[PDB]
Structures are given as C-alpha cells and as structure tokens.
C-alpha cells in the first residue's frame, strides 16, 4: 500500500533516531533527519512531509513547527506527522498516522464549541499504536507551543477499545441491572458517537469556570487535583447531556450513560498498586454519591438513585464554590480545600502523602483481574 | 481429599459471611459471633490455633491483642498460620488461614545476619493469601496492629520465584548483556528460591541497621522516593555483603548476589502503572547513578555490568550512608530533603506533579514486554 510504504519509511527512521532524544532539537541531527526524510522514496514526497523538512531545516532560528501545524489545523488532508516530545506519552518520537473524522451533532459542535477532532486511527507508525497515547495535544509536537485555536485530536478508537475491554465487564459485574440500559449490547459506532461527544463536552468544559486550564493548570497537576479537575468537567459534561433540551435525546441520554459508566468504572479501578489521579478523583465521586443519597449499594452491586442528577448538581455545585474562591483568596488556599475535600472521601495516606484504592475498588480489581 | 483442604473449606465459608463487616472487625458483638462459628466449625474449630484465636477474640474487648495465636506462631507450634487481619496495603486479607513449609537457610547466614524472618512457601492457603499482593505477612497485620522486634514475619518465596519467572527472567533475556547472569540463567525453582530466601534474611537484617532504621525512622521513610530508597538502600546492603562475607559459601552467595541485582536492576525497576510505584523510583535512581558512575554500561539499549560495579555499589551505599550520618546534628526532616535530592538527581521528578515519571528508558521496557 502506498500509505504503507509511507509508514514503513517512517517507523525505520523513528528505529534509527531511538536513542537520539537528547540532540531532538540539535540542528546537526536536524539537518540529518531533514534530508533522510526528503530521500525517503514515499514519505518524503507527502505534503506534511515537505512541510516538516521545512520546519526542522529552519528551527535553529525558528524553534516551532509552524509549517507542520498551518497544515493539520488547516485539515489540508487527514494525516500527520511531526516529530515529538511528550513526556506523557514517551513512545512518541517520529510518528505518522491517517485519521477519519467522525459524524458531529450540530448544536453540540455550535454551543459547546473547541478546537477538538475526535478521529478514528486508520494507519500510523509504532509510536502511536501504544495503548497510552488516547490523544494529541499541540504542545507535544517538539516545539512543545499550544494555542488556543490549535486542534487537538482524540483517538476515539482507541476509547471504544477500553469501553469493551474494561466498562462492559465491570458493568456487568459491579451495576444493579438496568443501570446502562443505552449501552447493553451496543456496537462500537454507538460506543463511537458517545465517546464523541464526551471528548468535546470534556475539552470545552475544561475552559470554563473560575480557575480553567491552561490558565491555571500548574496548580492542578498534583495527583488528587489533576483527577478532580478531570472530574469536574466530566461531571459538567454529565449535566449537559441531561439538562440542555436542544441536544438529541436519544444521543444524549447515551453520552450521559456512557461518561457516568466511565468515571463510575473505568477510571475508578485505574492505577496500579495505588490509584492514578482520575481514580482518585472517580473514588471520590464513588464515596460522595453513597454518602449523599445518589447511588447505593445492594449485594456489592451499585444501584443508581431516581435522585442522581440532583445529587450531581450538588457535587458539580460544591467543587464550583471552592473554586470560586480564587477570587479572594490565593490559589494555594483554593488547592488546600479541593485536598480537603477530596481526602473526605478517599483512602488518603498521610504520612506516604498518597491514596490507596478503596476497599470497593481493591476487591473489584482482585476479582476482575483491572 | 485433604483434611487441610476441609479445614480452609470452612474459613472461606467463614471468609466469605464477614467481607463486607469490616467496619465491625474489633466490635465485641461481631467478635463473639465470629469466635463462635470459629469454635463450632467442624474441622477447623479443633486445632489449637483456632482456640487460641478464639480465646483471644473473646478477650479483646478488655485486651485488644492477638496474644494466644501470636504467640502459638512465634513459638513455631506448628507450621499453621489463622488470625484476623486489618493489613491496608493487602486489602484481600480479613479472617485467613495457611500452612507453610520452611526453607533451608545457611548457618553463617543465619547467625551473622539474624533476624525473625520466616522466607517460608505456601503450601495451602484461604483465598485472601492467594492474592499476588500478598508477599508477606507482617505482626501488625493482624487487627491488634501490633508489631515486636521478635515477632516473627514471614515471607513467601514461592510467589517470589514465581515472579522472578514470569518477568525478571523475560528482562533478563531482552534487556542485559548476555553472559550478565550467568548462575542465574536456566536455574531451577530450588535455586531461585535458595537466592531469594537470602535475599529476604539480608533484607530485614539491613532494615535494622544504620542510623535510620525502620520501625525507628519509619514514618519519615514512607513518601514514594524514601521508602524506595530505603528498601534499595538494605539491598544493596545484602549485594555487598554476599560479594564481601567469605564465611558465606561462595556459590551460593554469587547466586544471591545476581538475584538481588536482577531484582532490582530490573524487575523493581518497571513497577507501577501509570507513575513508578516507590520500588521503581528507587531501581530508576539505581540505573542512572550506576551509569552515570561507571556501574554499568548501555550499548545499543542494552546493559553491560562493568567489572568495577562493586566497587560502584560501595560508592553508592556510602552516599546513602553519609546523606543519613547527618541525623546526628541535623533534623529527621533536613536528612529527609537531602534524600530527596539525591534521588530526583538520577529519577524523572515532575516538580509540578510532585510524582514521578517512569525514565524513558524503562518506559520503553515497559511498552515492549508488557511489564
Ligand atoms: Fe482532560
Ligand atoms: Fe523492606
């Protein structure tokens, strides 16, 4: 295949400069990975690829990668290829992929409106297939630059995978039945348009409120924070598909079942020996909706309360009034009381300063091997 | 089909009725219920370990302890393990049962090194034992969370051999040099288990020495960095000692040598998902203080141990123990932060975080063997 060739040519040279991170941005190794993507028989002739010669040729007076970028925030066409730097997503060096766009309801696109592409992988070379990298941010890209029109992809493939390899048994095995009745049984293009949705109602979320990111993000990263924050615009995600009646009802009600069943499930169980910061957060969650009346649990089993969208409402409500605090106190004064909230109703360790999974999520992991 | 098998039939059965009582674990009305279905318990109710807990559960209203059945284990009675466990970090643990058998254990090793450690395998256990957390058991484990300095603690090798063969070997063969482990290679279960025994004596003989031993220093020696530290600091201890004591048989003491050394340069090092766990940090600082030292050597993603890596391992137990020395006129908490700057010196410290990332080269480790 020709898009094939072009991969081939790319995941040999991401083998050959393995081991070169440290000179990524050295123009000796520049000039160099320049001119053997040029000579690459199949790649070096792809539009991206001139404009990444372009880039990289010239980023000793320039350090960005402007020429890379005007063509994929432009969608020129529906491939991409740059070379990287993320420290979160550390199998990325020199990569490629092809992507298709997906179906977009209107008035979601319109009044939730964010630079997001949620896209399906088609191709791509070794660093991508990783089960780590879910997205693309444009700050990843080497000159480590993001603005706010610049377009950020989410692999929804990649989402559907995790829904069928984690969500559907924990469903099955953790939740009183009816509780996801949209979901039982439903194929990866119904998982793919929910999944959609939440990644658009996630990135535009994250830009609202009294203390948004990227505005005020380096005092979200600690662990519990960095997961409340994921929360809260979940959470704000949740509400949105229950409460706004110009969405489709139908898609609506699906993306809601779908982001709770993820922060109630997935994302609770991750992490392991301790929880990562989204789990820390979803046991938050998980603790908050017992002890206020929105979920209860029968038999080891979760039963969703008629009340859960009140109770949702009082939790999106309680983060919003800590965080509306930021506006007479300092920001370090707001961190102590989101910590403070959080470890009511999580399984702090105060002298490790770290969290253990609840004992809920503990058994589930044994049980389910998650 | 067994008598032991009849007799973990009814602690699970028993297992199974309190899982979701824990809140009620040290309630007298839960405890008098409990011993009594222990003591009616056909099988299980006859053995003298099962009376002793009995007794001390009706007791512990007026002396929360474990007296009876701590002291039947310490005594080595028999070699039966049943209480009630409250253990945080093995959350499968509550009403539990085992039988063990002892390993071999050389007698310098034993005497020079002493401790009441117990590397012992599993013969039989109740389903909270069978968890792969559970590598150990620990006096304060049980619900009256006391721990003395010669109650012993038990280790359980065989769930160590097993992950030395399900992941330390796999690292072997991909990431060192070949000829790196050359006593370890194709050794049979006995072996690994004889290494990993010594491995478990040194360890909790270190953990005791130097001047910030644990339980004295423990609460200082719990954030990620500093408990990785301090369980790579008491195993480099034991390297040093199986390449320097010669009253130790000098096969089996190379053999221990390339365990801990494996286990640490490899194994610990690709622990924890998606951050290391505290292990990692500690193994990620070990790799880079040893490159960047002369320890070992990266050819081509690969490792070579150099010939002088003792002499490297001395250098960087005598910078642990010079960092800790200062606790004599410094604060527990100043030694605490010249620990920490050691470790992020050699680790991937996100300072915004305030956690750790995986280094990129065991990152890779992780992506290509699913580690
Ligand atoms: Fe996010
Ligand atoms: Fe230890």
Same mark, same amino acid.
């Given at each position: 295949?020709?898009?094939?060739?072009?991969?081939?040519?790319?995941?040999?040279?991401?083998?050959?400069?393995?081991?070169?991170?440290?000179?990524?941005?050295?123009?000796?190794?520049?000039?160099?990975?320049?001119?053997?993507?040029?000579?690459?028989?199949?790649?070096?002739?792809?539009?991206?690829?001139?404009?990444?010669?372009?880039?990289?040729?010239?980023?000793?007076?320039?350090?960005?990668?402007?020429?890379?970028?005007?063509?994929?925030?432009?969608?020129?066409?529906?491939?991409?290829?740059?070379?990287?730097?993320?420290?979160?997503?550390?199998?990325?060096?020199?990569?490629?992929?092809?992507?298709?766009?997906?179906?977009?309801?209107?008035?979601?696109?319109?009044?939730?409106?964010?630079?997001?592409?949620?896209?399906?992988?088609?191709?791509?070379?070794?660093?991508?297939?990783?089960?780590?990298?879910?997205?693309?941010?444009?700050?990843?890209?080497?000159?480590?630059?993001?603005?706010?029109?610049?377009?950020?992809?989410?692999?929804?493939?990649?989402?559907?995978?995790?829904?069928?390899?984690?969500?559907?048994?924990?469903?099955?095995?953790?939740?009183?039945?009816?509780?996801?009745?949209?979901?039982?049984?439903?194929?990866?293009?119904?998982?793919?348009?929910?999944?959609?949705?939440?990644?658009?109602?996630?990135?535009?979320?994250?830009?609202?409120?009294?203390?948004?990111?990227?505005?005020?993000?380096?005092?979200?990263?600690?662990?519990?924070?960095?997961? #409340?924050? !994921?929360?809260?615009?979940?959470?704000?995600?949740?509400? *949105?598909?229950?409460?706004? &009646? @110009? /969405? %489709? +009802?139908?898609?609506?009600?699906?993306?809601?079942?779908?982001?709770?069943?993820?922060?109630?499930?997935?994302?609770?169980?991750?992490?392991?020996?301790?929880?990562?910061?989204?789990?820390?957060?979803?046991?938050?969650?998980?603790?908050? #909706?017992? !002890?206020?009346?929105?979920?209860?649990?029968?038999?080891? *089993?979760?039963?969703?309360? &008629? @009340? /859960? %969208? +009140?109770?949702?409402?009082?939790?999106?409500?309680?983060?919003?009034?800590?965080?509306?605090?930021?506006?007479?106190?300092?920001?370090?004064?707001?961190?102590?009381?989101?910590?403070?909230?959080?470890?009511?109703?999580?399984?702090?360790?105060?002298?490790?300063?770290?969290?253990?999974?609840?004992?809920?999520?503990?058994?589930?992991?044994?049980?389910?091997?998650?």
């Amino acid at each position: 295949s020709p898009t094939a060739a072009v991969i081939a040519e790319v995941d040999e040279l991401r083998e050959k400069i393995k081991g070169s991170r440290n000179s990524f941005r050295d123009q000796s190794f520049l000039d160099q990975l320049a001119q053997h993507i040029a000579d690459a028989p199949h790649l070096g002739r792809q539009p991206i690829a001139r404009a990444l010669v372009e880039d990289l040729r010239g980023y000793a007076s320039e350090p960005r990668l402007a020429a890379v970028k005007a063509h994929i925030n432009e969608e020129r066409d529906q491939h991409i290829f740059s070379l990287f730097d993320a420290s979160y997503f550390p199998s990325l060096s020199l990569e490629y992929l092809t992507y298709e766009t997906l179906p977009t309801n209107p008035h979601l696109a319109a009044r939730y409106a964010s630079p997001t592409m949620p896209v399906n992988i088609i191709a791509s070379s070794k660093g991508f297939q990783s089960r780590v990298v879910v997205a693309l941010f444009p700050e990843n890209h080497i000159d480590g630059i993001q603005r706010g029109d610049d377009l950020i992809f989410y692999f929804i493939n990649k989402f559907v995978e995790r829904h069928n390899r984690i969500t559907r048994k924990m469903i099955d095995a953790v939740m009183a039945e009816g509780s996801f009745p949209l979901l039982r049984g439903a194929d990866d293009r119904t998982v793919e348009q929910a999944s959609s949705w939440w990644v658009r109602l996630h990135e535009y979320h994250h830009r609202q409120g009294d203390m948004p990111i990227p505005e005020f993000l380096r005092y979200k990263k600690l662990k519990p924070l960095a997961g #409340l924050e !994921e929360l809260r615009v979940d959470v704000s995600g949740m509400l *949105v598909c229950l409460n706004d &009646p @110009e /969405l %489709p +009802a139908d898609e609506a009600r699906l993306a809601y079942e779908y982001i709770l069943s993820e922060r109630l499930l997935r994302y609770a169980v991750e992490g392991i020996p301790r929880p990562n910061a989204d789990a820390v957060a979803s046991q938050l969650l998980f603790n908050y #909706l017992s !002890e206020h009346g929105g979920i209860e649990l029968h038999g080891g *089993v979760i039963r969703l309360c &008629p @009340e /859960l %969208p +009140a109770v949702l409402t009082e939790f999106l409500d309680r983060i919003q009034r800590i965080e509306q605090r930021i506006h007479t106190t300092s920001a370090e004064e707001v961190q102590q009381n989101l910590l403070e909230f959080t470890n009511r109703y999580t399984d702090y360790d105060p002298d490790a300063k770290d969290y253990r999974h609840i004992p809920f999520f503990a058994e589930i992991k044994e049980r389910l091997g998650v």
